[PDB]
Amino acid sequence: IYSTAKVCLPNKTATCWSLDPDLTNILASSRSYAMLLFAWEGWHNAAGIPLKPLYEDFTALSNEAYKQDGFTDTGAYWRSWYNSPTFEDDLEHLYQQLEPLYLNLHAFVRRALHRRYGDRYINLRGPIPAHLLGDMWAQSWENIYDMVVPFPDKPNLDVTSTMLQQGWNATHMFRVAEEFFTSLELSPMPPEFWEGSMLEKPADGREVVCHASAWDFYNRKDFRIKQCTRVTMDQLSTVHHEMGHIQYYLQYKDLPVSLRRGANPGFHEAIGDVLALSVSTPEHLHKIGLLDRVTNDTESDINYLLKMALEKIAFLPFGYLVDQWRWGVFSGRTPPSRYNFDWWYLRTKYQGICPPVTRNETHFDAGAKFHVPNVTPYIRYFVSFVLQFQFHEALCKEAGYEGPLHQCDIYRSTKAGAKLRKVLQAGSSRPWQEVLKDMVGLDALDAQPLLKYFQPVTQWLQEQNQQNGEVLGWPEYQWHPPLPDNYPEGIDLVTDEAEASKFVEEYDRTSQVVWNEYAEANWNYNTNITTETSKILLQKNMQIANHTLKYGTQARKFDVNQLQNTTIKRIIKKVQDLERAALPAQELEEYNKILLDMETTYSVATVCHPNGSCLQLEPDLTNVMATSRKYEDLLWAWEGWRDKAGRAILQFYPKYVELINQAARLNGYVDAGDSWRSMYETPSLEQDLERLFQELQPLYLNLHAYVRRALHRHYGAQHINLEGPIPAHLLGNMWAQTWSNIYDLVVPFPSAPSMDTTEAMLKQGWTPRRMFKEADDFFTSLGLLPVPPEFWNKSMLEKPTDGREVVCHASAWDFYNGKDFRIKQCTTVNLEDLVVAHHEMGHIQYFMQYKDLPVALREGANPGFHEAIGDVLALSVSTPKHLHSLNLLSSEGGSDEHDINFLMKMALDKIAFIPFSYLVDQWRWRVFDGSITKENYNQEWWSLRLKYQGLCPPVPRTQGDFDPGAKFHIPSSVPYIRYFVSFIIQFQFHEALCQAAGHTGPLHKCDIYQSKEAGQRLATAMKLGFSRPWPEAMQLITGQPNM
Amino acid sequence: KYQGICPPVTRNETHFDAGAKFHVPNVTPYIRYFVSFVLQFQFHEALCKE
Amino acid sequence: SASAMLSYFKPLLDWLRTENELHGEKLGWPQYNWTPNSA
Ligand SMILES: *[C@@H]1O[C@H](CO)[C@@H](O[C@@H]2O[C@H](CO)[C@@H](O[C@@H]3O[C@H](CO)[C@@H](O)[C@H](O)[C@@H]3O)[C@H](O)[C@H]2NC(C)=O)[C@H](O)[C@H]1NC(C)=O
Ligand SMILES: *[C@@H]1O[C@H](CO)[C@@H](O[C@@H]2O[C@H](CO)[C@@H](O)[C@H](O)[C@H]2NC(C)=O)[C@H](O)[C@H]1NC(C)=O
Ligand SMILES: *[C@@H]1O[C@H](CO)[C@@H](O[C@@H]2O[C@H](CO)[C@@H](O)[C@H](O)[C@H]2NC(C)=O)[C@H](O)[C@H]1NC(C)=O
Ligand SMILES: *[C@@H]1O[C@H](CO)[C@@H](O[C@@H]2O[C@H](CO)[C@@H](O)[C@H](O)[C@H]2NC(C)=O)[C@H](O)[C@H]1NC(C)=O
Ligand SMILES: *[C@@H]1O[C@H](CO)[C@@H](O[C@@H]2O[C@H](CO)[C@@H](O)[C@H](O)[C@H]2NC(C)=O)[C@H](O)[C@H]1NC(C)=O
DSSP states (O other): OOTTOEEOOTTOOSOOEEIIIIIHHHHHHOOOHHHHHHHHHHHHHHHHGGGHHHHHHHHHHHHHHHHHHTOSOHHHHHHHTTOOTTHHHHHHHHHHHHHHHHHHHHHHHHHHHHHHHOSSSOOSSSOEETTSSSSSSSSOOGGGGGGOOSOTTSOOSOOSHHHHHTTOOSSHHHHHHHHHHHHTTOOOOOTHHHHHOEESOOSSSSOOOOOEEOOOOOTTTOOOOEEOOOSSHHHHHHHHHHHHHHHHHHHTTTSOSGGGSOSSTTHHHHHHHHHHHHHHSHHHHHHHTSSSOOOOOHHHHHHHHHHHHHHHTTTSHHHHHHHHHHHHHHHTSSOGGGHHHHHHHHIIIIIOEEOSSOOOTTOOGGGSSTTTTTTOOSHHHHHHHHHHHHHHHHHHHTTTOOSOSTTOOOTTOHHHHHHHHHHHHOSSSSOHHHHHHHHTSOSSOOSHHHHHHTHHHHHHHHHHHHHHTOOSSOSSOSOOOOOOSOSTTSSSSOOOHHHHHHHHHHHHHHHHHHHHHHHHHHHHHHHOSSTTTHHHHHHHHHHHHHHHHHHHHHHHTSOSTTOOOSHHHHHHHHHHOOSSTTSOHHHHHHHHHHHHHHHHHHHHOOBOOTTSOOBOIIIIIHHHHHSOOOHHHHHHHHHHHIIIIIHHHTTTHHHHHHHHHHHHHHTTSSOHHHHHHGGGOOTTHHHHHHHHHHHHHHHHHHHHHHHHHHHHHHHOSSSOOSSSOEETTSSSSSSOSOOGGGGGGSOSOTTOOSSTHHHHHGGGOOOHHHHHHHHHHHHHHHTOOOOOTHHHHTOOOBOSSTTOOOOOOOOEEEOOSSSOEEEOBOOOSSHHHHHHHHHHHHHHHHHHHTTTSOSTTOSOSSTTHHHHHHHHHHHHHTSHHHHHTTTSSSOOOOSHHHHHHHHHHHHHHHTTHHHHHHHHHHHHHHHHTTSSOGGGHHHHHHHHIIIIIOEEOSSOOOTTOOGGGGSTTGGGTOOOHHHHHHHHHHHHHHHHHHHHTOOOSOSTTOOOTTOHHHHHHHHHHHTTTTSSOHHHHHHHHTSSSOO | OOSOOOOSSOOOTTOOGGGGSTTTTTTOOOHHHHHHHHHHHHHHHHHHHO | OOHHHHHHTHHHHHHHHHHHHHHTOOSSOSOTTOOSSOO
């Protein structure tokens, strides 16, 4: 039942993991809490649950047999071999001598495991979980040594290439080990061995795969070994151990049959392991020709002794534990109703480990150990582990080298070999106490040589624990790790720091080049819509799509919560979501086609009179909606544009909503609106935005009343009602987002002409090159990064037509070409051109500032900071003081008239936009929510327009009109709440920068020019990029982490 | 193990729950009560037998 | 559930669908901005 025990995943695949070599490799290699826990729990259940009744019956039968024999118990019979009335008491004293070593090692390893697996699964004052360290039974911690190296700078002396380079055979290692045996006048080796024993993996036939036994032919004349061969140092050590066993077999040939076992049952392993100790030392390897020279350094010694103490000290609680439990079971102190209880009490009391899962009397965890079903006593291993260091010390003191015990081999030690032979001659002929006294000098087991052997690493461990300041061991028992969400399907998600880092770096390096190629293709397409650059753009789009899909699927195999980092966790989370690649291929193609159709239909549609002369949206319909003061023409333009664009995009929008919602659902979210709102990482964004709008409502209401009065005074009372909304087409803008074009109608003080001078005299000069040069000069004067010269040597900005047929935009493009950032925009001669120039300059400076960050972390916090940075400096640029400077007006004055005119212009620019910015996404969020259906797309849009903006339809809008489709951002899947957030944020930024720069008094007259402290604080808050959430940048810029 | 009793709160080595019993500080052997409880019934059975 | 309510009116729902299709009636109110006053 122990042999044919298997565990396999809930998927019930055709294969199931076995103990060897599957489960052992999984527990020694995989640094995943979920996978380690699954393997541990599955193996323990499988190998223990069906073994309980059999073990109870075996215990009864064995006790009956050995009570009939004469002993009181089977455990008493097992203890009878060592021939000591107080054997348990000497064992207890021996372990109480060795407790501090294991306590220090346990604290050190627990601290390392805490740094690895975090604080949720590991308690710094409780016991370690019983699966996170080394073996499945936690007997040896060698496999943990990878993550607990004391000095990782030096290379560990565990090398297999050195053996292969020197052309070592698969069997010559046995010969050199034999010559090492013969060096100390030992090894009277028979010739039958090499001609009657095989030491090699099975070349033909299905014999045993691998083991660590040496079966002897006996017959008083011939012996044998059955063991595989490799090129590792561990194989060499095991070879020396097995030949020590063979040497023991040789030295008592003359003794009778029953007097064959060598003294104590642990003497076999002690003799086999003292030679292994004397062999694996680096200096023996150097002097045997396997190493160039000895590294006589403290750090190498500490590393070697900590590697050795991870198997020779971590095993001491075991063995003692196992046979104590078995003695208790045999004595009747542990009835079948207390097997697991006493087992885990002993496991926590001595070893200091807790079960990863909850155990109870159903389980038999002691039955997962090999030696409990296959009934072999286990205290022999503890006795041998204590004894081998005593033997090593005795041989070393008898070898004439009274130095450190590590580099203390017995090579070429005649007297040591003589003593070893003298001990080996008598096997069970005499009591073991006399043999031990004859060899060492005392007749009892002693733990002092074991302490002396590990003295330097003991001192190092105590010092390091004192520096780290941790409790020695388990002052807080009763602690068990929380379940890792072990409902067994999420156990294959890799949660390793090294793998996550490697994936992050690979993604960074491939994303840089692929995104640079995409940006270059986009720049080539947009700069020249001719010459068929659309094909290259499509190729780059396909490359980006497939790369994003591949790396997102690769990052979906990782995890987020269990990652013990901030930057790596953020990058993995931001890569795990595919914006549009989560859809199947057919749906993805349909979504791409729908989006392209909507964008092309918006960018192509024109409305015009049946006369024949025709106008486009920009700059023809916008111009006729900006400079025309007449109800008929404005109404015609408004209705015609709404008709064309909206009725064209209505046939596409519902399917687009369906597809974007499906993609967002596949990405984890519940809606496309939820996916867009997740860009801000605030679970309560809507409440905050509603609070801000309620705060800003009175100012908009007053401005709306004043503008309504002015419009009534001009147009009349037939078209305008003093109480009631103003029609949306009378505000000088197509969408009535900004009321700047009707400023001449709403001038508070007409006798204060200090703003019309700018565009009046811009004809005297002000080339785009020189005005952008002045803008970057102001940027540098603030204390920011100068623009690279490629912006003038390579990039262009003056593209009115430039051989292309695309309407003008105001966007900024970035690519990691070393140092290259370029823009495109249509350049006019007015102040708004300078304002938008400063906005784009702020965009480009934001691009520069986070240069050293990873590609995935190239965002400017939430996407409202990106727009805010340029407008912050545009606010200070547009002040009358900064216009008087740099010669942007004739003269300026602080009188009430000029100040009020300037404030009214700024209000018509920003306050009139607050409701529109909030309205666009507000409608779109309700559309993606399923709250607004196709039947009332328009009705709810106009309800929002009346409720927030306070506008009314100039003409009756019916169902099937789709007025929202006339806005550019709606048939382009571009979020719009970012403009609301930016308009809120930029005034806070301006106020904080002014406060850091002084300028006590009114805020609207403060200038950020020549503010080194403000510039440095803006830089120190902008260099964060998307690495940290936006409240931190808010706190650095302003002082409060709130909008 | 013996009483089948679990602590209501989470305990750990800062505590000393054996000291809350009266007989532990005021050191007095406690097994005499176990022995007396068994012996009284032994005596009762023997006397009622006789 | 509304299954019982829908099954109660099933003959009337079928007749109404037939009559509306025959008369060319369009379900809903496409001209939602309409108002009898009409200024
Ligand atoms: C335990 O029993 C074994 C098996 O009988 C004994 O080994 C045998 O010992 C005898 C002598 O007692 C050996 O015979 C002698 O061997 C050589 C042959 O060159 C020579 O000295 C003599 O002419 C004589 O034949 C015998 O070979 C050997 N093995 C076998 C298989 O019989 C062993 O001595 C006994 N041990 C004790 C402690 O009594
Ligand atoms: C071990 O490797 C050697 C490599 O040549 C093989 O033959 C040895 O050759 C040397 C040089 O002529 C002889 O002195 C040795 O006696 C040979 N035998 C040894 C070292 O065992 C040899 O066949 C290889 N043994 C294997 C592969 O089992
Ligand atoms: C490795 O270096 C250690 C010291 O780090 C050497 O220890 C020497 O031990 C002897 C014992 O008799 C002392 O007398 C010496 O003073 C020690 N040497 C020092 C402190 O430099 C040890 O021998 C070295 N081993 C090898 C193989 O080089
Ligand atoms: C865990 O986070 C740390 C702290 O940020 C990472 O160290 C930086 O990683 C970024 C990744 O883009 C590198 O640009 C920096 O150079 C790293 N800082 C250094 C090397 O000092 C670290 O890589 C993350 N991962 C691990 C496994 O530690
Ligand atoms: C031992 O038990 C106590 C009681 O639960 C643990 O909890 C803290 O005890 C300290 C005093 O020792 C109190 O000041 C704290 O308020 C307790 N709670 C917390 C959450 O800290 C205590 O941690 C345990 N001691 C050790 C060493 O683990």
